[PDB]
Amino acid sequence: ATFEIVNRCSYTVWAAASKGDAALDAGGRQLNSGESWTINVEPGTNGGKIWARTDCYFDDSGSGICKTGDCGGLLRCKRFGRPPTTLAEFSLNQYGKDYIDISNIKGFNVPMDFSPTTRGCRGVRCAADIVGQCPAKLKAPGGGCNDACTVFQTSEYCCTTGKCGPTEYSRFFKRLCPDAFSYVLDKPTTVTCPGSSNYRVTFCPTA
């Protein structure tokens, strides 16, 4: 499946694509403003994620750091990124269907549209001014708005035991982006697409 990753932000993003224990395609690439990168994700892949990293500093070998979304200090991500990161999440060809969503469970850094190329299912967007409205305790100095699990590290927010529910901090994200997951046990906003669809992820969407 192809994922066309498009940077319409004024700033460079270092796109990242991983399934947690391995890169998807090349795993990462620098996208200056206006640049695109089309990756191939193998059919049947589960637990894939795409995200933006902002303000990165890499040496020629591809090692360094990013202000948001860093993945073990690598340009070409093998693992997932450090919050805060708006997440495009997908599992493909799971019993005949693809499953896509956007998540704020690991916070928000860059506004995102995640859309199929087909009429057969809808897209998702989280593009509200979350960083400008971010509660003080969730502000990330590197840019972005942390989730409460990252900040407070308790089950109330991290949903590690029992049955967590919404909190003031999940509701902050949820009102701004109703179609994105705001905490681990949020009512799912996953979209079911026909199996083997293709997709476009746009950073800083407009129309």
Ligand SMILES: NC(=O)CN(CC(=O)O)CC(=O)O
């Ligand atoms: N249209 C946009 O998304 C503009 N961007 C700002 C920019 O690209 O300079 C907002 C953001 O990055 O949160």
